[PDB]
């Protein structure tokens with residue numbers, strides 16, 4: 001089911017480089033919006049998208065925690081991320097799936113769960 | 115595709131009352147956990163869930179913005195919310211289904227889109 005979450009970033013261009021080019025989420029839109037540059041990405045195969053925003057000051061840049069996105073191969077994702085210079089915690093098993101966390105340039109933590 | 119977001123609340127019992135009874139989300143879990151009480155809800159038929167947490171310092175209670183969840187009937191949701199005393203911003207028209215926003219007791223802003 002469709003869901004959209006707003007990730008607080010300090011520099012939208014650097015965030016685009018990270019999420020689209022480094023992590024490999026697909027770019028869905030990069031166009032003017034009501035509050036600023038509307039920059040929207042989503043994992044391939046997913047119906048959950050992230051908007052990389054800078055206009056919600058109650059959410060300081062890099063403050064996001066506690067987000068998990070489904071993946072079909074968390075070990076593959078982690079190997080690719082570490083190869084590309086990204087900090088990764090995990091993978092680790094839980095009763096609810098096999099999960100890992102990584103941080104974006106501002107410190108937002110993105111979780112992946114298989 | 116599965117996704118999980120953490121919503122920062124202050125009074126977890128009040129938040130449970132709000133998300134489960136006022137808004138009408140399903141209760142998926144309510145049990146003691148590693149970082150605190152694990153309280154998890156989700157819209158009916160959704161694969162996106164919300165965990166109502168109080169343990170992320172970078173996410174103060176009520177600070178969350180920019181979250182949008184699918185609904186099949188935004189007008190019905192708004193009618194139920196207003197019957198229960200919740201102010202609703204909207205609903206207002208969009209290129210594919212109308213949307214609406216409202217605040218939880220802490221001030222987190224939740225969006226629904228048809």
Ligand SMILES: [Ca+2]
Nearest residue numbers: 001048115162
């Ligand atoms: Ca989803």
